[PDB]
Symmetry: C2
């Protein structure tokens, strides 16, 4: 039986710039670093950066919708997003679904998101306004 | 400040086979499905499948090391991995780091992992034998 996400590993092209992004701009806790990677945490999330020569800096129009969303409070959301924009962090999508979201890119083009709201909130909102063809399971 | 992972979203090329993979082979809870996606949960993890025409079925030698690992108990690991093998789910590497891991591919080539062990456990093991050039904070 699976009990949750154990860790998220991101391939990065340059270790020090990527560590600075996740530690300083996103406020994650840096636990350890070595010449091929780094270990960070964000609440319960175990984040791994892996230095990978196969990684290319990918513009958002050349990658699919796969993306990673981090939780933030309603009160912190707007100034956090504004600080990222002032830091030159690129936006890859305008928010369109329920709950505050800021869609931004990491230094290698990994697609990230800040989101306010849980799965329960999304399901309740979708029951009120169902997506095309949407069905629910008890 | 950020408080954790809110959700993981995977682009998929065929919605029904991917739902069957995550719901039936991995045992995740299917909450909702629509013409272009699905919502599942795995413990506290909110997983979204997004039907994407752009999604390529990507061989593991043409993608980088980005991958997603799910937690499983030590008692459950061996038989869960064996069921994936019997279902023909591909393995993309052998375990070379501390703590039981099974490295497998989803139908579109997303790199997945079953793993027993926490961050605290990995940090404990690294303090006994650090990786190359390792610095501790
Ligand atoms: C919540 C799932 O990722 C989708 P959204 O970000 O389009 O809402
Ligand atoms: C835990 C970080 O992904 C690396 P590993 O799976 O190679 O140990
Ligand atoms: K949203
Ligand atoms: K391992
Ligand atoms: Mn999202
Ligand atoms: Mn891993």
């Amino acid at each position: 039986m699976l009990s949750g996400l154990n860790h998220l590993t991101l391939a990065v092209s340059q270790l020090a710039p990527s560590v600075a992004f996740y530690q300083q701009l996103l406020g994650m806790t840096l636990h350890a670093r070595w010449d091929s990677g780094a270990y960070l945490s964000c609440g319960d999330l175990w984040l791994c950066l892996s230095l990978d020569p196969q990684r290319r800096v990918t513009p958002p129009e050349e990658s699919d919708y796969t993306h990673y969303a981090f939780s933030i409070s309603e009160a912190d959301f707007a100034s956090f997003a504004a600080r990222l924009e002032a830091a030159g962090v690129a936006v890859w999508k305008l928010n369109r679904s329920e709950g505050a979201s800021h869609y931004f890119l990491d230094p290698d083009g990994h697609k990230l998101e800040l989101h306010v709201g849980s799965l329960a909130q999304r399901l309740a909102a979708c029951r009120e306004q169902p997506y095309k063809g949407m069905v629910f399971f008890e």
